[PDB]
């Protein structure tokens, strides 16, 4: 054979977990929609398409600096008039089963969710049902094992670093309302702890802090919090009052004569919440 004995090769890797979704019915061909962003080796382990579809969230970059550091950040896709469950940007382990319609989506994605959210009972139930469903032995078993192995590999990559970050001294993050004189913030740190390691990593990659103390310099990106966290999870709600207007101009004459080529401020609502602290740059 061509390749050296073993010698693990090096190539790109699709990173979004949902890329592994495939129809257990081998006789039914299926292709999941993945944004090309999935092939960027970055902190994101979900592609733009899955992110928008499932969490109502869009990625975004925040320049930081002399040396222009780029901090990852997500933004709301939640409209102004959405209410209740619609406001759950990222459901908690106690609500994801309901927020996400497990019945309406594929069994593989349900397993993916019950893996991300640490639901061993549901994972085992799905595994046993697939064992006793369809031609499990022929190829469905191997497909299920492949999907499970991919998800577990991603989770094993993430969780150790997540735990090290949790216990880390140099880098500290606090997901709550920096306005301690507020009621919608609560024990945001406790809820973040309740979240899974991979979910915690996603939250870190998505929600930027309201303030950021680097060594001795503090940068205040907001005088307010654009999202909150409660038992339900990450909620796209204004902690103090009326919801922020989210036009959603895309995706799902004299005025212009004056307003020809002309700097325009985006109407997007980025995610700003909590306090972050760091020593040195570590970049």
């Amino acid at each position: 054979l061509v390749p050296v004995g073993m010698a693990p090769r090096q190539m790109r890797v699709n990173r979004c977990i949902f890329a592994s979704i495939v129809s257990f019915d081998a006789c039914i061909t299926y292709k999941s929609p993945c944004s090309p962003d999935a092939y960027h080796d970055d902190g994101w382990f979900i592609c733009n398409n899955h992110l928008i579809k499932r969490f109502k969230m869009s990625k975004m970059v925040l320049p930081i600096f002399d040396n222009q550091f780029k901090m990852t950040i997500a933004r709301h896709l939640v409209g102004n008039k959405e209410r209740g469950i619609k406001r759950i940007l990222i459901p908690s382990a106690t609500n994801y089963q309901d927020v996400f319609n497990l019945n309406s989506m594929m069994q593989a994605e349900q397993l993916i969710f019950h893996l991300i959210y640490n639901n061993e009972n549901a994972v085992n139930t799905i595994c046993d049902n697939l064992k006793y469903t369809e031609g499990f032995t022929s190829n469905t078993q191997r497909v299920i094992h492949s999907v499970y192995a991919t998800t577990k590999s991603i989770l094993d990559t993430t969780n150790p670093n997540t735990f090290c970050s949790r216990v880390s001294r140099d880098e500290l993050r606090f997901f709550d309302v920096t306005n301690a004189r507020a009621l919608r913030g609560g024990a945001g740190d406790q809820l973040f702890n309740n979240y899974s390691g991979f979910l915690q990593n996603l939250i870190r990659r998505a929600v930027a802090p309201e303030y950021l103390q680097i060594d001795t310099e503090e940068l205040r990106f907001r005088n307010c919090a654009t999202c909150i966290i409660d038992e339900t999870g990450l909620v796209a709600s204004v902690p103090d009052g009326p919801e922020l207007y989210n036009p959603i101009r895309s995706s799902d004459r004299e005025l212009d004569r004056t307003l020809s080529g002309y700097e325009e401020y985006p109407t997007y609502v980025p995610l700003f919440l909590g306090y972050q602290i760091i020593n040195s740059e570590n970049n």
Partner: protein, 176 residues
């Protein structure tokens, strides 16, 4: 007419003075700065529990509650910042009511922690209104008894109308 409204203003001052000791609450340090918390009413909640509290209105007549203040000697032509202060006060009152209505459930859990009784659905509103009325009494103290028999002010009346429309819609949205 507006003379009756002046009577309303004096009556609300005196009646606040009356109940703040008939039920000895005067949580008069609080204001409309943000959503109120049961941590400042625990004992007041205990005293409230002594009475049946269903005799309360879900909506707030923000109009009639605040209109009497609009009657003042603006003709002095010395403090237009007084009128601007009134505009700020009314707008912040509207925001306070809107936030209270939006997070009424949240306050419901708060007062579930503090005195878990069936009357909490009314205790929340009673706390809201009583803190608001203490703020009204403090505002009355701040302002002077310069109430005329009659006074027109289109701008203030328009602000009242537009903010209270939001207030009433929010309160109405409290379904059950």
């Amino acid at each position: 007419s507006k003379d009756i409204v002046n009577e309303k203003l004096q009556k609300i001052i005196v009646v606040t003075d009356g109940m703040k000791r008939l039920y000895e609450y005067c949580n008069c340090k609080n204001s409309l700065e943000t959503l109120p918390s049961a941590a400042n009413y625990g004992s007041l909640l205990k005293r409230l529990n002594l009475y049946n509290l269903d005799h309360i209105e879900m909506n707030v007549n923000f109009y009639e509650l605040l209109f009497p203040l609009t009657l003042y000697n603006d003709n002095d032509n010395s403090d237009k910042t007084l009128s601007h202060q009134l505009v700020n006060y009314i707008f912040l009152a509207s925001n306070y009511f809107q936030n209270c209505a939006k997070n009424f459930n949240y306050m419901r859990e708060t007062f579930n922690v503090f005195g878990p009784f069936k009357q909490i659905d009314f205790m929340v509103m009673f706390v809201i209104k009583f803190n608001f009325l203490c703020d009204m009494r403090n505002f009355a103290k701040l302002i002077d008894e310069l109430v005329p028999n009659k006074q027109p002010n289109m701008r203030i009346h328009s602000v009242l109308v537009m903010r209270d429309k939001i207030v009433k819609l929010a309160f109405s949205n409290l379904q059950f």
